[PDB]
Write a protein that binds this ligand. Sequence first.
Ligand SMILES: OC[C@H]1O[C@@H](O)[C@H](O)[C@@H](O)[C@@H]1O
Ligand SMILES: [Ca+2]
Length: 305
Amino acid sequence: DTRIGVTIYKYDDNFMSVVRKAIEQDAKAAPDVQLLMNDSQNDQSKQNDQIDVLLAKGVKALAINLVDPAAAGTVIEKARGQNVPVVFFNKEPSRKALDSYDKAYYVGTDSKESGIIQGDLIAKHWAANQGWDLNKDGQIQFVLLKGEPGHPDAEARTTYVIKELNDKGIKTEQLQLDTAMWDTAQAKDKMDAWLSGPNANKIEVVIANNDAMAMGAVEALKAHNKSSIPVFGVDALPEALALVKSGALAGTVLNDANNQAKATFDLAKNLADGKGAADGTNWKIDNKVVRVPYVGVDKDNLAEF
Ligand SMILES: OC[C@H]1O[C@@H](O)[C@H](O)[C@@H](O)[C@@H]1O
Ligand SMILES: [Ca+2]
């Protein structure tokens, strides 16, 4: 049986929970694969030790969701010594890191695209819901819940949601902006703070860089009897889709966990087998990278997900 080792940066990250469960199902369909999957508990030192163990166990490929993207070289050097291929996923290593090893690959997304799509989606719903412009000024007064500072998906979603609105002629006014570190509880706390501060009843739209944080904002709005304020996320988590259907979330953007898991598995299995990474598949690998598209989601198209 071919052993494939997988490290997940943090099991209880909502999005990576969807990804890891999907990878488990791809591996279950491969009768000759034993999956060795680890929770790194948000600590790169723990992950490094897990990789040593996976290599001791003779895995034929590694699929690595880094805690710290800067540790890509550390991981590569472990793998190099055993000639083991590494498919990094979701936390993007640098170009130089990928180019340092002939058997390093990456599966992820075009981070900018999700921000653009989210801004276009907000624009559509803004146009359709003129009552959302509480102060009648033609501008969106917003608050924004950011992911981890320096994470490329947080930075791009934060920049491009606003750029896209502004580029379409929709002026925006940032009433509050802070990180909630991708986390529901932190986002509920932060949103509750904003609902307790001087801008509370000026807020017209809540923009979150992911669904977990959007969900925390939804909870805080409910507690304040302000559920009429729309909230937008990114990921299209199953739980978030249920909230789109119920009207509690105004819209989101699919971060396609199923295809990211499938590509990661397929590439890792091919490489474990000594084949070309994309053999037998339709994955498009561009200079060692696969990027899976995002798709905007709201009630009108929900049943396609
Ligand atoms: O790296 C982890 C992060 O990846 C992003 O692409 C997701 O949208 C976030 O929900 C997740 O927290
Ligand atoms: Ca306004």
